Design a protein around this ligand. Structure first.
Ligand SMILES: CC(=O)N[C@H]1[C@H]([C@H](O)[C@H](O)CO)O[C@](O)(C(N)=O)C[C@@H]1O
Length: 308
């Protein structure tokens, strides 16, 4: 095609993310009259999200996904998006990104410093905790070898509840669980399904600890070369796909607990008050490290009412 473009992702071919990316690719090919074709590169084929963000910056990859929280790699105060229990729900995540001074500045910096244009934001689920033994209370987390992505906020979740975090690549997790080299992991339910972690985890605990969004991102080096009518095709398609993406996740969260029960998984509902209490020293440490920019971002987010 005139524009043979590439969209990389860590999620696999059975995931919501892949499904929504297929919708995006289809719409762009149709509405561009075949001028643009977008090929998908799932399962970390091109590296992980940190690696794919570098590739968008350089111009060697055209599209990828990232959470708003992942920009904590560059701007420490952006960890606010994944401090456990701080962001209440997706309504708050949307307003945090688009309707605060903090979020609006972050979007501008992504463009200026990191070479990426934010096309749209979707919901990517709320993280829960699976394990090879029951989590009936925070006490059960003690010494649990909890696999997490290599991201400071997930490492801190594990640390502050008393678990022993082991950071790993997403592709390696299934085998780590199966072999009991680790005792659990902490993705949203849709990823537990997509990765078939339920085949290798007898327990699921509703820890509700981190709220994931998902940003549809384009390399500035690619976006700048598209005539404005094709830029509009891509932007409109990204917005349409994001609504569909969010819907997949919202619908799954209704149904997936019952799906896992029928696969033989036991579900627990530990008291979250001690989980939330355990994070108070982490928020303090966040404010100590990130200074006034962090305190301000927290304030702006804590002001957002979570009811639509
Ligand atoms: C956009 C993306 O790649 N998301 C991935 C996510 C993020 O890397 C971390 O939450 C850090 O932001 O990590 C996973 O949940 C994980 N490795 O278990 C897999 C997700 O597909």
């Amino acid at each position: 095609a005139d524009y043979d473009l590439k969209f990389g992702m860590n999620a696999g071919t059975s995931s919501n993310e892949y499904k929504a990316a297929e919708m995006f690719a289809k719409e762009v090919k149709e509405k561009s009259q075949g001028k643009i074709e977008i090929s998908l590169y799932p399962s970390s084929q091109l590296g992980d999200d940190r690696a794919m963000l570098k590739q968008l910056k350089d111009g060697s990859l055209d599209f990828t996904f990232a959470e708003s929280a992942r920009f904590q790699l560059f701007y420490p105060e952006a960890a606010v998006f994944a401090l456990p229990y701080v962001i209440s729900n997706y309504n708050v995540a949307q307003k945090a990104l688009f309707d605060t001074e903090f979020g609006k500045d972050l979007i501008k910096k992504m463009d200026k410093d990191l070479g990426v244009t934010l096309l749209s934001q979707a919901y990517n689920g709320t993280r829960q905790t699976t394990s090879n033994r029951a989590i009936n209370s925070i006490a059960d987390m003690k010494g649990l070898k909890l696999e997490v992505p290599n991201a400071a906020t997930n490492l801190a979740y594990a640390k502050y509840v008393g678990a022993s975090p082991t950071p790993m690549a997403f592709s390696e997790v299934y085998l780590a669980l199966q072999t009991n080299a680790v005792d659990g992991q902490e993705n949203p339910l849709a990823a537990v399904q997509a990765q078939k972690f339920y085949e290798v985890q007898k327990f699921l605990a509703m820890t509700n600890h981190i709220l994931n969004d998902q940003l549809y991102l384009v390399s500035n080096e690619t976006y700048k070369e598209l005539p404005e009518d094709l830029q509009k095709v891509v932007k409109d398609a990204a917005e349409n796909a994001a609504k569909y993406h969010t819907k997949l996740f919202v619908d799954g969260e209704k149904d997936l607990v019952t799906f896992f029960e029928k696969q033989g998984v036991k579900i627990t509902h530990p008291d979250l008050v001690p989980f939330k209490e355990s994070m108070k020293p982490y928020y303090a440490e966040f404010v100590k490290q990130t200074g006034q920019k962090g305190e301000s971002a927290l304030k702006q987010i804590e002001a957002i009412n979570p009811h639509h």
